[PDB]
A and B are shown apart, each in its own frame.
Chain A
């Protein structure tokens, strides 16, 4: 495979699957490497742990461990055997690193890679009153039940809703009033993180939901830009199996389309069919999807060498 896997401490399937995803997001990994970690206190520094884990996934010829990283979380070894949601970790972990990157040479990285903005439009139906709200996002929750594929999922997302009845809009001086609400994307980030809502109330929606290897999302912007069309290429499929369960990540790291499967310590080659179509579901299916913006793939997935790992870090890591 050319790539190393990661040891399962017990239930760290979620972490290993994300650690691989965040590792192969090369621009992030370079950024983690360039973080000022003066050795701090190891069992206290999440960036140091991320640098350890990232360094060995780049160099080791045997499965890498996660002990120190879960240590740096403030966790005991029993917490390593509770099962967890991969997207909750990502929210918690990337928020951690984002603030730990402030005031250092790598401020802005996580939002520059992952953060987009959306606009919510609200207009009253029986009074002249309109409102707007612009909110940033690091991920998109896509509905699944009743939608055959990702295209129908963004249509629903941007569809127009009726704020009615027990959900009338608080139109200020006009009081509670019926209204229409609509969402649009102002910007989509270089690395798109899609959380498929494979859950109804936990029942877990195992239905067939199809995602593609290319995704044109220009239809869901507010203003399209012809100097950077919004085509995204599929990079990762974080597959969940269960109801608790197991987590695996399928990845074409180089964006070339030669995929591998990452099941904790075992890294396999595999076919497109095995990573995309076999994961539409209908117990095993995609839960999270990583698409990278075609215009930005060269930068995001630029190749990473020992020339990108600061020397002070190697000396810290080696002498340890």
Chain B
């Protein structure tokens, strides 16, 4: 399915994903298209930050849903 990922520029990129995909699988597709190393991605859907281990189906994520990519400011 085609979901949407808003990048660190705010631009929407298209991502090709599967309800089976885990969040680490999704993060790698993002690295493949935006270059962001997975160790630094934080993806926000409906105010939930998605967890490495769960899949996209566990968040009712579907075609044309939109993820928001975010990095960290540690302190």
Contact = CB atoms under 8 A, between A and B. Distances in A.
Interface string A13-39: 110000000000000000000000000
A200 B70 CA distance: 10
Interface of A is mostly: mixed
A145 B42 CA distance: 19
Categorize the interface residue count of chain B. Answer: 20 to 34
Contact of B49 (A88, A136, A143, A247): A88
A198 interface: yes
A115 B47 contact: yes
Contact of B65 (A82, A133, A246): A133
Interface string B56-75: 00000001111010111111
Contacts of A247: 75
A114 interface: yes
Contacts of B6: 141
Contacts of B48: 91, 95
A275 interface: no
Given A94-B47, A114-B47, 6 more contacts: A14-B74, A84-B72, A87-B70, A88-B42, A141-B10, A201-B8
Interface of A: 11, 13-14, 82-88, 91-92, 94-95, 114-115, 120, 122, 131, 133, 135-139, 141, 143, 145, 156-157, 161, 163, 166-170, 181, 195, 197-202, 204, 240-242, 244-247, 287
